[PDB]
Write a protein that binds this DNA or RNA. Sequence first.
RNA 1: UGCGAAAGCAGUUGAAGACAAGUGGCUUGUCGUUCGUUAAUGGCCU
Lengths: 479, 86, 778, 372, 231
Amino acid sequence: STARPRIEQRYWRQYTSAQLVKEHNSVTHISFNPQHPHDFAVTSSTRVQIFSSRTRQVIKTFSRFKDVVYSASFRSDGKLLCAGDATGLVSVYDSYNPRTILLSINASTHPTHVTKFHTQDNKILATASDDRVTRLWDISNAYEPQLELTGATDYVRTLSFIPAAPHLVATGSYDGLIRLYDTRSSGSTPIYSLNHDQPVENVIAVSPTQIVSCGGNNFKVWDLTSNKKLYERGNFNKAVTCLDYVENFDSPMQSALIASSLDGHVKVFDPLDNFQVKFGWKFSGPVLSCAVSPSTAQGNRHLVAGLSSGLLAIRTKKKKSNNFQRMMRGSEYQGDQEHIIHNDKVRSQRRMRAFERNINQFKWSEALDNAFVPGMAKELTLTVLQELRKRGKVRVALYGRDESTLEPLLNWCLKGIEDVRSASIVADWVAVVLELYGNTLESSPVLQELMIDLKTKVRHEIHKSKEAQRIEGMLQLLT
Amino acid sequence: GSIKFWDFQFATLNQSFKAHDADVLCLTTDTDNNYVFSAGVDRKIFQFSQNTNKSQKNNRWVNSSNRLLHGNDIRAICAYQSKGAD
Amino acid sequence: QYKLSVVSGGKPALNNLSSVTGNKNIARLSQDQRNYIIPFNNQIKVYSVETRQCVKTLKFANNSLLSGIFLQEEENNESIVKILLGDITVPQQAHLITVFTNNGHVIVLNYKGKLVESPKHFKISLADEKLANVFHSEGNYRILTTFKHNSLQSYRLYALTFDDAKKQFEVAHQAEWHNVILSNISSNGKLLAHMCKDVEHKSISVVSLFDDSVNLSFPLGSILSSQTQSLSYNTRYVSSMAIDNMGQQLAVGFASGVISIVSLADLQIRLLKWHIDSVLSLSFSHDGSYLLSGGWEKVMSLWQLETNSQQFLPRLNGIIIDCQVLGPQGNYYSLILQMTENNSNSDYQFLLLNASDLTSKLSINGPLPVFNSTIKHIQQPISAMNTKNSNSITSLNHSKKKQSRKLIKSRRQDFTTNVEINPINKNLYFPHISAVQIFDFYKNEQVNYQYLTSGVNNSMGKVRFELNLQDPIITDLKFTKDGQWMITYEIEYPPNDLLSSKDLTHILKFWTKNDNETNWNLKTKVINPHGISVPITKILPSPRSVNNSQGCLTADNNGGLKFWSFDSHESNWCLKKISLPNFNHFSNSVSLAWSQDGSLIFHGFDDKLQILDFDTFKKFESLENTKTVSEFTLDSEIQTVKLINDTNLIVATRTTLNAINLLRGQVINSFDLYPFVNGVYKNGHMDRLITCDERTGNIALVINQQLTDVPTINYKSRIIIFDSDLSTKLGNFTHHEYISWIGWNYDTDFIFLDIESTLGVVGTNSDIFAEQLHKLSS
Amino acid sequence: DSPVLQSAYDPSGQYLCYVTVALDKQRVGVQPTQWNENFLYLEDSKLKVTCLKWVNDTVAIILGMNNGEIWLYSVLANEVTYKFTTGNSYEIKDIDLMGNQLWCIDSSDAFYQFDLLQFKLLQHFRINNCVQLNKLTIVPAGDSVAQLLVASHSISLIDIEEKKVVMTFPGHVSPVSTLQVITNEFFISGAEGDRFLNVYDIHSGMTKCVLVAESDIKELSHSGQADSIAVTTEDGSLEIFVDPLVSGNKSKKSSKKIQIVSKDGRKVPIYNAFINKDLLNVSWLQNATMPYFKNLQWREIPNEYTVEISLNWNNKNKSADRDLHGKDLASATNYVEGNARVTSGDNTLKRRSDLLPRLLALDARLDCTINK
Amino acid sequence: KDANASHPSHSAIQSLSFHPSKPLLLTGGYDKTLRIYHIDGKTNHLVTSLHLVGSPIQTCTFYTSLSNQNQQNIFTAGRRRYMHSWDLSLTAKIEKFSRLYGHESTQRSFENFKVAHLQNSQTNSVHGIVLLQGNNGWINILHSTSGLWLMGCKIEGVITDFCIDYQPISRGKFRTILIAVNAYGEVWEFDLNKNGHVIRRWKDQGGVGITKIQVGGGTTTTCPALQISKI
RNA sequence: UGCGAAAGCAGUUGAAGACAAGUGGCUUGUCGUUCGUUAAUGGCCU
């Protein structure tokens, strides 16, 4: 004896709860807690706003800045946070406590555009304003940086480090010309420069060996151990505004990097197989500052999009008595420290449905009825019509019916003749029922209204099929 | 539908038959109880027999025959026996 | 170095006697119910029921001792009819079995360890051309014998009597009658019941044999009620029966599906009614309270009598033919499945199952081959209709005369079965009707049975009008010959009286298995390649040249060819290159060939051998035109183009043979073929007839059919082996029985298959204390 | 603790006779060493087996019970043949025989002579100056029926004719539990409780060596020429000394150690080994009462040595009828598609125009039937 | 010695039995691990310990056939709708009885069953019977070897318990009776070697809800016989 | 039923014996008959 037989992009589109919070101005860029990004900060104008992974609104914020602020950046330990403004007095202060300010030290009088900590050191902080020089301040003695990292032609604008290689700082100016200084050097020359063409929008280092820079309507990669480019991509309407990278998360892609390009859609490439998008999802206009959370968000994982208008789109994935209990205590032992173990279980299968058990018990009439209801699925109806035609006799399935039962069959063949895979089979269905039931329509003259309606729409559809066949005949002639 | 045969003394069940698939409404027999014929709203009249020596020693009834010759229901049966008719 | 050696097992060989049975099963147990003595046509199998293996076979060719009873040429109807447990001669004294075949040949076979080479080939006097049965109890054994009318045998009850004349068993001649249409024996053998047909009407008797106790007869016109006095013969006709061991209850299973129960003294009538088709299998329990019933529905249905209700067993994947309980306390149901999805052969299936949870123990198969027609006395079981699976009641003499005189006056007798051999484990696949049978012939059994269509094979027993809903028959499946893929192609039919019922439509798919499992998972399906309504009859797989056997080129009877190679960037099967020459003619006599290094593609169309190249899918027209002949033309309608290696070649047509050299682009040799075959084949069948070696050529098989003194029922295998491109007739192996195919197993050997389905091959003081304590162990 | 009450090997080490208790009644089982089920039961709880010894030669055990009977019990005929009574209803403590003549020792300190060929009591004597006595051994010198060696708590030596103590030995602080002669001049003594066997000369009485185990001794076997002594410790290990009488000059330590641990991290305690020349048979209760054996070849195993044994610990009970997912493997497996990628044999407008002859046929027959 | 002390248990001990001749105890509880001990007065150990998942067993017992005494089938059952039989052979082969032939609508559970011999009384096929409880008044007698529904018996009022009393008839013949109670406490006493029909019925002097009936003195479930004449 | 192809091409479509029924006899229909031609409310569990 036996039983009875039964008859990637999905991951990034099971991202939902995409809510909107409009700011009062644009969103410069954002930040993430490096040890655990269960909170994150956006750089609103004259305030920095910090949100959790649960309530999805501001859990803390600071708004006693006096000018528009530019850069928000956590330290790698994730306890305090830096913020650079348009005044050029860059302020570092402790996170998870907004109302205290640790130290606000002036940079050059130009607006401090970017400011980020060292990626592994906990006491040295890189700042860059429009003084054509960037600075490695030390927060222990924040009275002068250790390095006046000079050697720019114009407008040092985006900083980064190399992660595993400490002494290499990759700065980028509005000259192409991505510099990478050694911190033990004189601070005036890089060992080499990377030749971007446009002014770089920002640069990150996705490996200890490979960085990606973006500026202008295409982004570039750069090898650092040999001064080499292996890749560009430029399928964007405007310049790729911001970049982001993530390693070792839960997907059919091991590690991702996204580029956001002021044109609604944000693109999700991968260094697994050289930078192809799975699918990019649009937004409500000019997308300026967009990134997903890093690796250790632990399930609940948020992508945020602060547009150049200023609206933040947040789209998140999210995966009797004691005596009676002592009466039924032994319920979880499951055979650990004793000799043999039986297992003879029958499995509670998938939910068998009423039409399915109608086929199982030869209940063909109510199987037809359960097929032709709007509550059931259309493709389920197509498959059960195909399967019961292949299984049983349509004559003995229709051996006693009348037109009041026949009418949803015709009412659904009305829309199912236009199908590609079930057209001729539902034509065979109506062929059998009119093959053996002419006496019913000549007794009751009702359903010939649907017969003539069917006739004119099937003349339309046979004209459509004829013209499609002759258009592929045009392809055959112009082969 | 559960045609149940109870014993008179000791007030106990003797047999059961859930062969009827609806509400039984009527049933009769003959003189020395060789048969019992039942019917109800399954429009089926069916038989139980106690004729043979094994059935009359063990006092046992078998679901011998079954017969549908009706349109909607049964609400009454009765039976008669004679030496001129049965 | 080559020789005939027939090796592997065959059919279970039951009582294949139409109505000359009541039991048709003698696959017995020992009195210690742990090992199963089942006869075959090719072996005796002793099975350990606690492990479902064979602890000992008694093969039907290993001893001339036994096989002098059955090794002859045309009288190979020596089928095996009764097994008893002990030595019959000595009174009950230790445990070695006794065996009777159809001629009354008493055999005393050994049962434990290794046999003693003196089997007591005893024989009683009268048993010349008969044995219905003997019936057993203590001491007295009573033989049912048959002599010779209206096609009715005569049954006589004699007694084996043997007291002191130690070299002769003598019969004692109790009972006589001369009319039998149906008979049956009890489950304990102590009672039997037959019919007599003796007009004022037909009649039925129930008789004893071990005493004078109960011997009676009565017409069954009283049992036939007025409804079956009135209506048709499928309601008047007894299909099966059963009696009780007590002698007070007779079941008659009528051909409509009703199961009458009648008594003995008062002769009452009692009706059991669930079966919709006919009923073939009726048996009582030892206590006589449950009636086991098996009909053409796929259910095992057992009735409790004193509720007149039933316990089911839904999907036995076949057709139940005979069933009873045979445990002494009644714990084991022995039965026979048949599974008539191929109408060619009566390929049964012996199995028993426990009474505990109705789990089946030791499904005993034979090899189930897939022929093209009926073989040799292949009758059909009695149903109510003359359906596509069997004939009806009224066509008994009609269909037996039709089949007998069809084999007499016919000339078309090929029935060449297609098989395959797995290069992972060297078991052979019998690709069944919409299914497979993976037979491991090394221990002559099966391993699993996979369904190969999404049809109505499983989930519904086929009933009177659904019998003409035949299942989608597969033609063949191709192994990727690293042993990785079943690329199967199957044809499918609709039910008739339908406008879409015209065409027989086509579907292929692809199956992957690991070496762990025995089933295969479905990778992908392709519904009608080469467009719609085109046969895909010849598809060729590739050697390890391209991507370790990923090439499979599909072809047509029209002549179109596509290339199909697996890949992994698309984790799926797909095609490579396209060609469809749409001839407005068609011809299903097409062969193909392919070079083992991957260079030449050979389309053997209807007498034209067109040549394509491998690299660019086209006719090789080079830049020289100096004997770059890429189009041959042969003598007549060919059926095989076969490449043994890259130099020389064999093409086979209807009338002759030809050999081809292609490096030296000429023809070589020729043999005659129409002096062997007359009209036996259908077209395309020589391809599945002969199959090449890797080195040593092929074995062209002589198809013969031995004349009467029209063909008689003597047959042939006088196969002559060839070596290295039509050079040597180095062996003419003679054999007295037919053949269907010859394949190459990879030890340079050639396994052939018989119709009487035997697979074979042409190939290359303390010691006394310890012993007495071993005796005191049990 | 061991559910075997006691056990003893046959000479030449092929059979084990062991007394166990089973629902407050002792039963005796015999077992060979490469199933036997002739359990001689006892009658009642007040009758338990104190001591036992094989004989060698119709094969038989003799069993000294705790009332004053010696049940000479054949192993083939599964019953006691002869019942050697004594005069007292006192529980005996040891038996030992040589040829025909057999000695028994009482709780009332008497010495009893028996003969298993003639079934009499020959002589009957208690002696002075030895009171707690629990085991003896006849000293063999060919036909030395005289000079048997009696031992509890201070080992004595007895001529059977002058019938006095001829030589006393330093015993132990406990009663003696093993007393085995090993040569014509040396004998092993070992008390209960103590780790310390000691070989005594039978002429000079000086201790030659003290064998130090690592746990309490339970039993011991020795080779025929005393070149190898295997003891079984109380905690179920085994200690085999090689060449104990050759000189660690006074107290010989354990030479090789064998335990039998399972592969489940479970040690099973072995007991009652037997050594002949270069073969060692160990015994251990596999289930709760059935004794299994093992024939370790002895000289080439390492010094410490564990013996793995197959043991059901968490084994999945697998039927002879079901697969992994529990389907009857006497029937056919079912068709399925799973998640196969469905595509026809083409690669869309020709997928459409394939059924276009069928579609025009269906629609013109539809027009046919609607005008019919 | 505490008989659980060698290998302990965790849940309650809902069933406890002895082998009829061999020195074996069986323990069975809600932690679905039926253990078997070899028991003796000094130190008693675990012979085997079958565990079976998803079936917290309620009652379980030994059984031997009267005829050839070499069967040794455990029967076990819990709150579920299946019970298990076991031929013990010192890796186990156990069968799962679940085939209810006649009545399928009266068992919400199998948690109360007994096992009992009977004779055939026209032949002498002495064999087993499982006696399961039902829900209304139903107690069903099956087969022990096969699993066939032999028959059933319904009493009027809710079954609380039941027991089995054999009685000899001749030297080699005997007859089995089933005794069943209500909560009300009027008992039915009916033989079941012929068909199950009431041959005596009476009433206990008292009780509002009676809970447990047990017969004894001669032989019974707990003290079974070995030869048929020993009953 | 034969060939062949997913196709058309050619034929059986008989006789005897026995029985049943309607009217010794006749008349209508069959055959678990020799021979010839290739021709029954009864539906799938835990």
